[PDB]
Amino acid sequence: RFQTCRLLSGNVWNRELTIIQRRILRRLRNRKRSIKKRKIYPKKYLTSYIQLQTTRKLPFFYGDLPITEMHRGTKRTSYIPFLLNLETRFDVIPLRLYFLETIPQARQLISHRRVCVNKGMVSITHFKLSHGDIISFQENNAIIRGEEIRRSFYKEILVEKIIGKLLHQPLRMWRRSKTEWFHLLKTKRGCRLLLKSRFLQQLRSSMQEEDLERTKKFGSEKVCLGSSFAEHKRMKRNLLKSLFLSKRRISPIVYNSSLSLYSNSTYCFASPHKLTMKRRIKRIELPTHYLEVNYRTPKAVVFYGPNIGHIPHDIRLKDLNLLLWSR
């Protein structure tokens, strides 16, 4: 519920933020979340404040179970029942990690409907399954949720993202009608393939570039440098020694090319991360520590268990370095 986002001073993934909700989130997020989180230094147990915030974020993420109680069930602090319930609780974890809403949409499914595992229905809603478990819908589930997963993987990863990243900054009441139009276009199973083949090539190039940005963040250029340590020195050798050889002892165009390519060497191997970015969209992080689906008809046998650094945390590495004291 949005009220919970208001309490958490931020955004707990309410769906379909109506207009005044847009207003109130901008207000709350910026003003409050800044002012508190920006520059306070309170004795107000900021450690324990953080603790409350994280132990309150996580339960909605996994629906509504109390996770302090999960902590308490064992005598440890954390990270073990975490890696465990995420190894599987079998509806809230896997069905959402692939294709659903972890909430009582993906719940009650195992209650009444079926997702037979190894053709075996396991209708307990909290199972733990690992190391060789075939996850399969029923057929009367398939004949609808094939279409549902298609309209998900496209309307909610192509359409919404594409009306995002663009058409955006001045007016959203306009991305509204643009979503209307692109809905009319996605109504079409030929438009599908044409879009597969459309100018999204350009956007993927720009995305490669922005990943290169977030890469150069922390030394990709430094390792490029070390890996091509000679080559720049070789260019400098060209320049300086052809100088002290040809003259002052084609020269002008030797200097032309040497200057150009050498200065360009130094530029490309020392441009330090002009970020200045407007916003940042988010990727969908598919699990390939678990095995994929026959996305045609759901048959998504697992092959392994999860790690801790590749999980959809809506929390930065901090406060989860306070919960999961991990490297």
Binding site: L243, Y262, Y267, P272, K274
Partner: peptide
């Protein structure tokens, strides 16, 4: 001519240095 190119190397390299220096001076704002 080659002395013009040597001072040209000094010119372009100090130019690049100062440009990236101001670039970082601006990136330190955010």
């Amino acid at each position: 001519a080659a002395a013009a190119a040597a001072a040209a190397a000094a010119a372009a390299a100090a130019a690049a240095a100062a440009a990236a220096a101001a670039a970082a001076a601006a990136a330190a704002a955010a």
